[PDB]
Design a protein around this ligand. Structure first.
Ligand SMILES: [Cu+]
Ligand SMILES: [Cu+]
Ligand SMILES: [Mg+2]
Ligand SMILES: [Mg+2]
Lengths: 156, 156
């Protein structure tokens, strides 16, 4: 049970999909905006495609990424809604998500900015490596990229 | 090119396997002991079994763990070789590993201590969550555990 935001986009051997669902509760406490003060839990579902250049087998979750989002109401007066997702696990597996408060029903544009593990902006840079030798190594990390979709929200 | 250390062990809906290979090169530099100054690249392969209680589908890599290792030469009289693995990716996928200097050919005992994402000892604790709500939540993280195996090293 989830609500898709547009259709998934394929880049650098990965599938990037955007979805939302009801606000959630998460451990550790204090990271997510409280469910009672949110409208949705927005998610980025990122999985490896066949022949992924960073060594992930097809269908694997791509871990240690850092995702920033920008949600803008189309024809709205208000400014965009921005934030950072957090890596986490739910009953459907690991993902990147965040509890968001929107600006009522209507048309929205959503932009995700996806940072690789080595990006300056990624706080997980010192904790994740990549083999670089010819025998066991992989291609360099993909470069930071943005993906966008349109969606209509009505209250869930 | 991976050499097995004993047989994999199953615990809390996860398969825990130990392997080693020749030392590797890794980005970012300064984390791994240099390939020339090492004997092996030790690894912990941890994947979800069926009906994993933390929401991982079968075969998925279990991310954001922290592994400490203790390698003892059987009848060696030398002090145990200790260290922390690091999460990383190679051509066969993500894993936990480290470049290690051994104490020559012979029989060794290897002990891994596996810390869940919420362990005090785990440095990635503030970067990974777990849904706890009725609709999308998963069971609490497993408790820190250790696993041991014997292996005979002769060089590679
Ligand atoms: Cu989530
Ligand atoms: Cu490695
Ligand atoms: Mg989901
Ligand atoms: Mg391996």
């Amino acid at each position: 049970l989830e609500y898709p935001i547009g259709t998934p986009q394929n880049l650098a051997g990965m599938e990037i999909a955007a979805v939302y669902l009801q606000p959630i509760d998460m451990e550790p406490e204090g990271h997510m905006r409280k469910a009672s003060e949110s409208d949705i839990h927005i998610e980025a579902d990122i999985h490896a495609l066949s022949n992924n250049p960073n060594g992930y087998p097809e269908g694997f979750w791509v871990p240690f990424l850092f995702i920033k989002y920008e949600i803008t109401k189309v024809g709205g007066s208000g400014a965009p809604i921005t934030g950072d997702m957090m890596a986490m696990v739910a009953s459907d597996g690991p993902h990147y998500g965040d509890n968001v408060k929107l600006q009522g029903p209507g048309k929205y544009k959503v932009k995700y900015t996806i940072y690789p593990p080595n990006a300056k902006e990624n706080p997980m840079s010192p904790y994740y490596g990549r083999h670089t030798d010819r025998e066991t190594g992989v291609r360099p990390w993909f470069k930071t990229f943005s993906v966008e979709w349109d969606f209509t929200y009505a209250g869930i």
